[PDB]
Design a protein around this ligand. Structure first.
Ligand SMILES: [Cl-]
Ligand SMILES: [Cl-]
Ligand code: NA
Length: 129
């Protein structure tokens, strides 16, 4: 599913992501824009052989099982395919565990490089929330 901007904002809010671990809703929207272009089916293979999945490009090295990433973990206890569903619940639940892991949103390289420090508020401007 390709979400619209304000549509994803409202789904993330409904799922408890606004100010989760202190990160305002715009940070989460901005990270999804640059990690997946708001597409839940986005997948990208990494050089180490792991793959990133879904709207927040969660990686199989640590967070989900895809059966093809040696020596990896599945800390969110889910098949990586769950992260590609039109329902964002699994991506949100897993992202809450990631962002509570110590490094905050820095776990998402695109957030650090394209959202951190910017006017993220712009991402939810105009939206009914
Ligand atoms: Cl695996
Ligand atoms: Cl933090
Ligand atoms: Na894994």
């Amino acid at each position: 599913k390709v979400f619209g901007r304000c549509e994803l904002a409202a789904a993330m809010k409904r799922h408890g992501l606004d100010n989760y671990r202190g990160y305002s809703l715009g940070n989460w929207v901005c990270a999804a824009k640059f990690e997946s272009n708001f597409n839940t089916q986005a997948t990208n293979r990494n050089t180490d052989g792991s793959t990133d999945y879904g709207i927040l490009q969660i990686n199989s090295r640590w967070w989900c099982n895809d059966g093809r990433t040696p020596g990896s973990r599945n800390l969110c206890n889910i098949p990586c395919s769950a992260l590609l569903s039109s329902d964002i619940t699994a991506s949100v639940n897993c992202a809450k565990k990631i962002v509570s892991d110590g490094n905050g949103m820095n776990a998402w390289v695109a957030w650090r490089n394209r959202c951190k420090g910017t006017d993220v508020q712009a991402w939810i401007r105009g939206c009914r929330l």
